[model samples]
Target: MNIFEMLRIDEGLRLKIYKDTEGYYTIGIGHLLTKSPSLNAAKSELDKAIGRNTNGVITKDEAEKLFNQDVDAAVRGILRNAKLKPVYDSLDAVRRAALINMVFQMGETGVAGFTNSLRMLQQKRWDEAAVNLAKSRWYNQTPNRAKRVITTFRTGTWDAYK
Candidate 1:
């Protein structure tokens, strides 16, 4: 069996989008359904399957495909929207993944809103970037993740996440 099947066995694998323990909408092996990015964007035909009593179901293969697609889009978003794409490309995968994760959570423009951090990034000032990141609202929102990103930036270490 595939690793995804293994994961499905381990984690709750509802075929449809359903609420979790906290009642937030989640689906497809724990993909959270947060705020929609574009209001006017038309829903996909697949979305029609989800409604009041049901959120639809998918084959395990479909879940895996969706997961891969989501990850690719996040990576592409990071590379496309980041002004320091080349710089990020030069970093190790772990570091790049940290940035990618942040971008995925906040959107590219939200990451760009870190003006001071961007300045530090542009200058290749890891220490300064770490400092500036700590001073931002993003830091306040998720201190542990901020610490992980900033610590990685400051130390050039990949496993700095707490």
Candidate 2:
């Protein structure tokens, strides 16, 4: 499929650049640049992408650029990650989105370590997986966001998060 599908499935399509857990600048489907762009640069870049005045947020065009450039590499990392790939591929799109979103937030290494959660998903136990996900430090660290993810696990829809 195209980058658009992956971006939707994997990330929440944020127009603003934000930091990853390691304090790196990330924008558009969790695309990480070497360092955060300066505010002036940020404004300039988004303006260029949109061909109009923008404060700091990226446009859809810029997000597409990020997706095209980064998705392949990101998929490689996630698919090859021993701890998550097997489980990752086994999921339906609804559940897969949740897995991908987790990986997008914490990276494969971080989320892969959620063994019980993965196991619960593999076992197809929605209720247990919801509980398992809520038990995570990932949840404790970002309750509101994680709650939406847990909602997906429990209800199998993107609507709860949306």
Candidate 3:
């Protein structure tokens, strides 16, 4: 499956505003409206995407557009990291998607903090990389997602696409 399909399942679509696991004001497939340039800007963008004044909700198509934008942003952020560029280049598409998924949930800086895990990933030491990821507070906070990502890293496959 494509990254968007996998992420759609992982993040889940929500037309209305809701608090995320970390209590951020998120909506439309984990889009953090609170972290947007401004709440007004975000609302305007949503309204524009939906082709109307949505008030406080969006359609599935609008949410899909937002999800695409967020995924693109995550991919760009990961690619822009000097330290991560080469490591990302060395990975296959599945592993690359896994990396992007991680960055989507955590920011580029958060993933960057996993120095040892990244090294293991670059080195193609799958088990070691998985082990390193499991050691993080991120793994603790979101165990199921972490397990799926770790499994993807370890197997270099889309088995975790569920």
Residue 66 local lDDT, model 2:
66
Name the better of 1 and 2 by lDDT.
2
lDDT of 2 at 156: 71
Candidate 2 per-residue C-alpha lDDT over 82-132 given as tens digits, one digit per residue, 9 for 90 to 100: 878888787777777677667766777888889888888888898988987
Q: What is the lDDT of residue 7 in candidate 2?
A: 47
lDDT of 1 by residue, 31-140 (tens): 55644433222123235423333235566766666666656676787678656475467666555665665664466778767777767765778777888889877688
Collision pairs in model 1: none
- lDDT against the true structure, per candidate, is 0.59, 0.70, 0.85
- TM-score: model 3 vs. ground truth: 0.89
Candidate 3 C-alpha error for residue 52, in Å: 5.9
- Which portions of model 2 show Cα errors greater than 4 Å? 1-23, 34-60, 68-72
Top-scoring candidate (lDDT): 3
Which sections of candidate 3 miss by over 4 Å?
35-52
